[PDB]
Design a binder for this molecule. Structure first.
Ligand SMILES: *[C@@H]1O[C@H](CO[C@@H]2O[C@@H](C)[C@H](O)[C@@H](O)[C@H]2O)[C@@H](O)[C@H](O)[C@H]1O[C@H]1O[C@H](CO)[C@@H](O)[C@H](O)[C@@H]1O[C@H]1O[C@H](CO)[C@@H](O)[C@@H]1O
Ligand SMILES: *[C@@H]1O[C@H](CO[C@@H]2O[C@@H](C)[C@H](O)[C@@H](O)[C@H]2O)[C@@H](O)[C@H](O)[C@H]1O[C@H]1O[C@H](CO)[C@@H](O)[C@H](O)[C@@H]1O[C@H]1O[C@H](CO)[C@@H](O)[C@@H]1O
Ligand SMILES: OC[C@H]1O[C@H](O[C@H]2[C@H](O)[C@@H](O)[C@@H](O)O[C@@H]2CO)[C@H](O)[C@@H](O)[C@@H]1O
Ligand SMILES: *[C@H]1O[C@H](CO)[C@@H](O)[C@H](O)[C@@H]1O
Ligand SMILES: *[C@H]1O[C@H](CO)[C@@H](O)[C@H](O)[C@@H]1O
Ligand SMILES: *[C@H]1C[C@@H](N)[C@@H](O)[C@H](C)O1
Ligand SMILES: *[C@H]1C[C@@H](N)[C@@H](O)[C@H](C)O1
Lengths: 7, 378, 7
């Protein structure tokens, strides 16, 4: 993980 | 926001044969009155999820299959239902690449594998091993050239070396991928990344080298070798460099093991043109004629359609593509792939820039890749 | 707004 979103 | 009833919007990467695809779409429109617009946005695979449902997304998205499981988990892709007779038209393993949670979620188009591309005039006999590349560079440097340039910014290009001596993404166990068991920090992965960092430390490659830099360098005859996929052959053809396509070099005696993509066409689950998309893909695109049109624009690789692949297999460049593909692995399509690629991208950049040691970089990658994550990000 | 990040 480590990134964000939201998809 | 461009989706409309009775029309099709298609996204495909700008290095692929989008003009050839537009031509199949032109034929589709003559036959059905359904206009087909092909677009090639930057980072289309990152853009897709947030614009698919209500935004300016496409009716059809073309990308390697590894991204598709994640899309499907979020309900973004229409299940496809080709009949057994149509399925029998394509190699069985290509259907497996686009099967996720028991369902087909895209049409396989072509198998993309990385190969070693070399300048026959600068280097009539390419190296069999990664280990001999430093010496070959020193030689070529003396003549104002370099041995090898390829895209270091995308982990797709460096993974084959990292995997060669034992690096892996997720452990396959009890018939499924174990998302908590990541193999990017084992002995083989460290050896692979260490060799890469050393190439950079000893000035045989540049840590900021990217796709466009490596392509120009090779196509302008300044570097003896590059690593790239079939789509790249068209531009080399234009350059008139006398090139060969061959098996990737071994590392510690083991084949480079590229992660292999199956270029696939997914249908937007929120498109009001799903039936239209199915018809285009099954009856127009996945035909000897449709694929030839895209292939003659930019080569596809080893196509999924048996009848056409049998014609392409005569090409030694395709034979090389297949050989590298067989020594690698079709990518998993599980949602956790994007976390994996992100972890490796980060580790490679940090290690190559000297901002972390290999050991520190890969340890962090293993930790991050394994972090639990739900279907909406993380 | 309504999107995420982080860029
Ligand atoms: C990030 O979002 C997730 C929610 O994600 C959604 O739900 C989870 C269960 C699912 O697995 C995922 O796919 C999505 O459906 C939250 O659960 C996290 O707590 C959140 O983490 C950030 O924000 C929290 C506070 O709300 C912090 O404690 C975390 O450290 C994270 O911080 C991020 O925002 C901070 C900026 O203030 C930065 O430190 C960091 O970028
Ligand atoms: C960012 O959102 C996450 C996840 O939000 C929850 O799960 C998602 C799926 C769902 O859509 C949403 O409605 C929630 O149920 C939260 O867990 C994080 O806390 C949130 O971080 C922002 O807000 C916190 C404070 O609550 C800040 O500390 C963070 O720094 C974030 O704030 C910035 O990010 C936002 C978007 O840019 C801005 O509002 C703010 O600048
Ligand atoms: O580098 C990580 C990246 O690799 C793969 O992307 C390839 C793609 O499969 C090829 O078709 C071509 O477009 O080059 C890309 C890499 O630059 C994965 O498919 C992708 O998800 C991943 O992020
Ligand atoms: C969720 O999945 C999307 C599409 O693959 C990524 O672009 C995003 O960064 C995250 O991994
Ligand atoms: C912030 O900027 C990035 C890069 O343009 C976008 O991709 C993102 O959607 C947001 O607009
Ligand atoms: C996060 C907020 C916004 N991007 C939504 O579309 C997703 C589902 O959750
Ligand atoms: C959010 C987490 C990750 N995307 C970081 O790169 C940014 C700056 O903040």
């Amino acid at each position: 993980x480590x990134x964000x979103x939201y998809y | 926001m461009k989706i409309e009833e009775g029309k099709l919007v298609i996204w495909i990467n700008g290095d692929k044969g989008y003009n050839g695809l537009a031509e199949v779409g032109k034929k589709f429109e003559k036959d059905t009155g359904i206009k087909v617009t092909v677009e090639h946005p930057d980072k289309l695979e990152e853009k897709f999820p947030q614009v698919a449902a209500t935004g300016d997304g496409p009716d059809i998205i073309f990308w390697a299959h590894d991204r598709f499981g994640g899309y499907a988990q979020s309900g973004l892709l229409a299940e496809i239902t080709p009949d057994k007779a149509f399925q029998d038209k394509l190699y069985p393993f290509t259907w497996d690449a686009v099967r996720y949670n028991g369902k087909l979620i895209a049409y396989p188009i072509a198998v993309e594998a990385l190969s070693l591309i070399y300048n026959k005039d600068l280097l009539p006999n390419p190296p069999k091993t990664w280990e001999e590349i430093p010496a070959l560079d020193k030689e070529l440097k003396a003549k104002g050239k370099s041995a090898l340039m390829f895209n270091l910014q995308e982990p797709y290009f460096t993974w084959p070396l990292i995997a060669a001596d034992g690096g892996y993404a997720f452990k396959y166990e009890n018939g499924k991928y174990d998302i908590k068991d990541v193999g990017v920090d084992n002995a083989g992965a460290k050896a692979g990344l260490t060799f890469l960092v050393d190439l950079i430390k000893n000035k045989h490659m540049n840590a900021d080298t990217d796709y466009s830099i490596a392509e120009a360098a090779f196509n302008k005859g300044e570097t003896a070798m590059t690593i790239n996929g079939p789509w790249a052959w068209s531009n080399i053809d234009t350059s008139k460099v006398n090139y060969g396509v061959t098996v990737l070099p071994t590392f510690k005696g083991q084949p480079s093991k590229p992660f292999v993509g199956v270029l696939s066409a997914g249908i937007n689950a929120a498109s009001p043109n799903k039936e239209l998309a199915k018809e285009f893909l099954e009856n127009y695109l996945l035909t000897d004629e449709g694929l030839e049109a895209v292939n003659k624009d930019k080569p596809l690789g080893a196509v999924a359609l048996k009848s056409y692949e049998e014609e392409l297999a005569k090409d030694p460049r395709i034979a090389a593509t297949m050989e590298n593909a067989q020594k690698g692995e079709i990518m998993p399509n599980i949602p956790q792939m994007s976390a994996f690629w992100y972890a490796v991208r980060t580790a490679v950049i940090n290690a190559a820039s000297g901002r972390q040691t290999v050991d520190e970089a890969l340890k962090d990658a293993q930790t991050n890749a394994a972090a639990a994550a739900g279907c909406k990000x993380x």
